[PDB]
Amino acid sequence: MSPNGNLIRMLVLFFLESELHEHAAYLVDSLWESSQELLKDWECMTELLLEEPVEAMSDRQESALIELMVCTIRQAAEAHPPVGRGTRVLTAKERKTQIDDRNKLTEHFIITLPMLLSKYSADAEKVANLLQIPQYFDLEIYSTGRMEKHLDALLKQIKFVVEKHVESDVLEACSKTYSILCSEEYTIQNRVDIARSQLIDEFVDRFNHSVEDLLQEEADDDDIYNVLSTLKRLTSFHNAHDLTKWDLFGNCYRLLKTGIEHGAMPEQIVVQALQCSHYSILWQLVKITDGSPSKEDLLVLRKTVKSFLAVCQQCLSNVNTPVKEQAFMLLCDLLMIFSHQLMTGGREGLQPLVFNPDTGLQSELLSFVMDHVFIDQEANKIEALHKRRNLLAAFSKLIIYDIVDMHAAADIFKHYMKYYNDYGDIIKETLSKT
């Protein structure tokens, strides 16, 4: 009870103080054969986190307990070592345990996860880590346990969280949590759908008034905060939720047009308005793949796509390189999606939606690569390199399927590989003689 609480308090200290385990997931996995009983005392944990002391817990150790708690909850639910330690056939008794564990952590965390979110509402890192939990719930128990009350509680708290936060980690964690609760059962489906589309509506109104405030305006620092703040939330959700019924593309399109014309739109507002527009378009495509869509259906989406390909192209010329990257990424996505590939799986109705990038665009997709993939000059650089890598791999796809001139490409890859082709073999010797 407090005998387990001491063992957990010390286990959190051995993790932080000793870089003998870097990764929580890996620590827990290693101790799992040997200390399963302790690592699934979930009441003991939620207690430590929620209770006031009689030695108090410091911000950093709390964070660590929460991260270890989630890792235990996974390993119990999945009943297999995490990604990186995997090698998968359970015995009668292993399976029987998995079922009993899942029941325990669900019954428990349904009750307690709302209270954890409550208490730690402003700690983005903590909230995002906590919201990884419902994915492991036996969601049917929101009916079985007559536990309707606690589902309202969770939803009340996910509201507070979205209303308080703008970090893309938190928001995404909030979007995924809805997707999980929202479609997993029918019993609960209806309830969640309502909470969601209320949450949305509130943020579309704010966004829309915020858009108007800004474009009508001299433009206040607040005018800029309000537009961005709301957009971010809607962009986050628009990935896994189909918000097409609210014409978001419309207002994003204006934001982007104003930033090109008068050239004075904040860089984060542009990037978000780009991403949000893209998500608008993919969900427009999905409805039009699955329906039996008419002529005008197609042609109205086409104009939307060309008017947007235009915006992304123009946005390559934005001063702020983050814009350029977003611009580029969406161009290299969209040009691939709205290729002739779109007439695979018998879907040759979609011919009018196909796009071939003109010369001027192809040349600017060659530009960016020389200017922003292949550049002259800690952990911010290994993360920066993997991105230019993705920007290039996304550009690679366009070259292979002849959507940009495959020879103009090759000549840039020639130019920058020059020293590998000129002096590489003489480097080869070196790393076999030293």
Ligand SMILES: Cc1occc1C(=O)Nc1ccncc1
């Ligand atoms: C670091 C590196 O990256 C690519 C090539 C090399 C390289 O040549 N390293 C080296 C040269 C001479 N002695 C020892 C090592």
